Curated annotation (Swiss-Prot), chain B:
Coiled coil: 14-45
Name of this protein: Spike protein S2'
Heptad repeat 1: annotated span: 1-35
Function: Subunit of the fusion protein that is processed upon entry into the host cell. Mediates fusion of the virion and cellular membranes by functioning as a class I viral fusion protein. Contains a viral fusion peptide that is unmasked after S2 cleavage. This cleavage can occur at the cell membrane by host TMPRSS2 or during endocytosis by host CSTL. In either case, this triggers an extensive and irreversible conformational change that leads to fusion of the viral envelope with the cellular cytoplasmic membrane, releasing viral genomic RNA into the host cell cytoplasm.
Coverage span on the entire protein: 932 to 980 of 1273
Length: 49, 45
């Protein structure tokens, strides 16, 4: 996957997180991306390894 | 019966958990270091 610049690999699943309208993606503790927002549909998706 | 009152101690057991959690949190964080290279990502290079 690539989400507007974020290059990575993983499984995409429906999330239950809530981003602040200005945030595009989230990171977990230990500073690794764990959720993104689809640029086209504007939905939050978790990334499992 | 007084033993429960003194509990409701186990810091020696929490320290074991903490020491391993800290080594695993540090091991992952050390991947975001350039070590004097142009970048820290083997694909971007
Ligand atoms: C980006 O454009 C697409 C065009 O396909 C939009 O998708 C449509 O959105 C409307 C409004 O809710 C729906 O009624 C349509 O059913 C959608 N199309 C399909 C094929 O499902 C999309 O909403 C746009 N995104 C943004 C953020 O504007």
């Amino acid at each position: 996957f690539n989400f507007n610049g974020l290059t990575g690999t993983g499984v995409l699943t429906e999330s239950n997180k809530k981003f602040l309208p200005f945030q595009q993606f989230g990171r977990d503790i230990a500073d690794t991306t764990d959720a993104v927002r689809d640029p086209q549909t504007l939905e939050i998706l978790d990334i499992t390894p | 019966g007084k033993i429960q009152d003194s509990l409701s101690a186990l810091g020696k057991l929490q320290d074991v958990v903490n020491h391993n959690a800290q080594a695993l949190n540090t091991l992952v964080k050390q991947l975001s270091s350039k070590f004097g290279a142009i970048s820290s990502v083997l694909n971007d290079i």
